[PDB]
C-alpha cells in the first residue's frame, strides 16, 4: 500500500456538513501527460479529465475540526512532479481542486456548496500514516 | 461605435508569424453571468464559453513588434467589469487567454503555437482610439 505525501487542505462545506480535501500526492500514482495550456482547455472541452487527469479519490473518513466538531475527509492524491507543477501555478491549483471535487461528487454522490479555501497553516486533516492509497 | 480601454497584451506566435492578443475591455460589453468556479468547470465541460462569456473577438490588424518587423494583432474585449476580476486572479486570466486564443483559431482559421506570455511593459499593440469595437 502507497503513503499519500501532505500537499494542501481544502475547506469546504456541504448540506451535510464540514467536508475537507486532501490534496496530496505520491510518486507512485501516474502523472498527467504534461500538455499545453491550449491542450488543457481541448480536454475539458471534450470532458476527458476522468481519464487524462490521473488522481485517487480517497473514502470518507470521519475526522475533527479546530472546534472539535465531526467533520468528513477525502484524500484526492496526484502524481508527485504533478502536484509540484499545481503548487506553482495559481491556475492549474483551481483548476485541479474543481475537478477534485466534481469526481468526489460524482464517486460518493456528495453536494459541495461552492465555497472553499486552501488553509494556509494546516496540510492534512486525518492519521497520514493510515491513510494508504 | 465603442472604443476599447487597454487592459493587457499577449505575445504569442504562428506558422504565420508573431501574433499578439489586446485582453481589452469596455463597459458596453456585456458581462458573462457570475458563476461559480464549479459551475464555471461545467461550463467548459459542455463547451458553452462561447455563449456564456462574451467577448468581441476582433478583426485581424498589421501593427509593428518593438523590433520594426511586421505582425498581427487581435482584439479580444470583454466588460470592464469581469476584465478587473480577471486581473486579480491568475486561474481566470489564464483560463479567459485560453479560450480567447481558441476563439480566434475557430473564427479566423488560426494555428497559434502553444507558448504564449503577458507583457510586463505594454498594454496593447495597435492604435487605441481606432480600433472601434
Ligand atoms: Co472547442
Ligand atoms: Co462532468
Redesign the interface.
Given at each position: 500500500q502507497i503513503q499519500p505525501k501532505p500537499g494542501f487542505c481544502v475547506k469546504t462545506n456541504s448540506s451535510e456538513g464540514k467536508v475537507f480535501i486532501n490534496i496530496c500526492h505520491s510518486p507512485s500514482i501516474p502523472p498527467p501527460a504534461d500538455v499545453?495550456?491550449?491542450?488543457?482547455?481541448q480536454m475539458?472541452?471534450?470532458?476527458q479529465a476522468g481519464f487524462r487527469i490521473p488522481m485517487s479519490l480517497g473514502e470518507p473518513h470521519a475526522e475533527l475540526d479546530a472546534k472539535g466538531q465531526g467533520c468528513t475527509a477525502y484524500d484526492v492524491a496526484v502524481n508527485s512532479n504533478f502536484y509540484l507543477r499545481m503548487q506553482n501555478?495559481?491556475?492549474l491549483?483551481?483548476?485541479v481542486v474543481?475537478?477534485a471535487?466534481?469526481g468526489l461528487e460524482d464517486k460518493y454522490g456528495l453536494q459541495?456548496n461552492?465555497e472553499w479555501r486552501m488553509l494556509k497553516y494546516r496540510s492534512f486533516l486525518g492519521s497520514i500514516s493510515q491513510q494508504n492509497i
Open positions: 499545453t495550456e491550449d491542450e488543457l482547455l475539458l472541452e471534450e470532458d501555478s495559481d491556475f491549483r483551481e483548476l474543481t475537478i471535487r466534481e459541495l461552492p
